[PDB]
Amino acid sequence: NGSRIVSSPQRAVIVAYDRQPFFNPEPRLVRVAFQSDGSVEEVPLANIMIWQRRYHGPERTVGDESRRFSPASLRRYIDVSDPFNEKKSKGEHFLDKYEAARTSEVAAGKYRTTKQITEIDQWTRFDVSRADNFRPLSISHRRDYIRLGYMHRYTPWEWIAVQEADQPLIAEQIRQDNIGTSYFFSLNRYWRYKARPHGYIRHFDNEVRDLFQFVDGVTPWKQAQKIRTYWEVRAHHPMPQFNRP
Amino acid sequence: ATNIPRSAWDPAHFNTNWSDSYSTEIAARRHWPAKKWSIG
């Protein structure tokens, strides 16, 4: 059968998938194992359905893990020599014993590397003229528009609407069609609203029959008679003919 | 239908994952300290 024969939705779970655009080309064969008995086959992502949990986010298929509120909402602190808390003991070690005490450990470097959160990034004039990452519905309020140094990242819906309205719509943008192609008339339609062929001579079939007809209708043999060839005049040379070397 | 689409004014169409304008262009231009290691 021709390249596949495809069926109804049947539950599965992914046991092997690669995100790599090389390890997993177009189309991305999802190496899956189904729910019936766990049969492992490679079926592409076109034949897969995810239990969305939200209609928007890029990964809809995981929840929204709420996190703990801080009454010290702007008073958090972040060590930066290790932001991700990779330097911690999760279990007591067998090398924990030879540990010299907190004596002479004068400036425990983490305590002097941690920053309050406000410090890492600055709200600089780029942030004070920062342009939006969406199509703004209106920037009339933008009294910081030009003198203050702002330009939208996306034309607002309102001025797009002005620019759509102010000007017409061409009737040749709709391409309605219910009759079909007119095989006989539409091309030989009125000589004013005619389909001028364009490009080569090899597309001017009507005009050329026309040119033959006009040219014979005006040009008489009593005019086209005298027109000599080169050989019919070269005949009277004392050497009319000599083979090229 | 609506020449200005739904998803832009519809709070029902608002993104649960709308990550705003200063957010990413601030958390992006940072460069976290290059000296996580005492030696390196």
Binding site: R53, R54, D64 | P11, A12, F14, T16
Partner: peptide, 20 residues
């Protein structure tokens, strides 16, 4: 999945960030 969205994102005028 914003909690109490039918009063906050839908019916609270200022999106719940603005205090009137």
């Amino acid at each position: 999945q914003l909690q109490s969205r039918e009063r906050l994102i839908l019916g609270t005028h200022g999106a719940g960030v603005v205090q009137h």
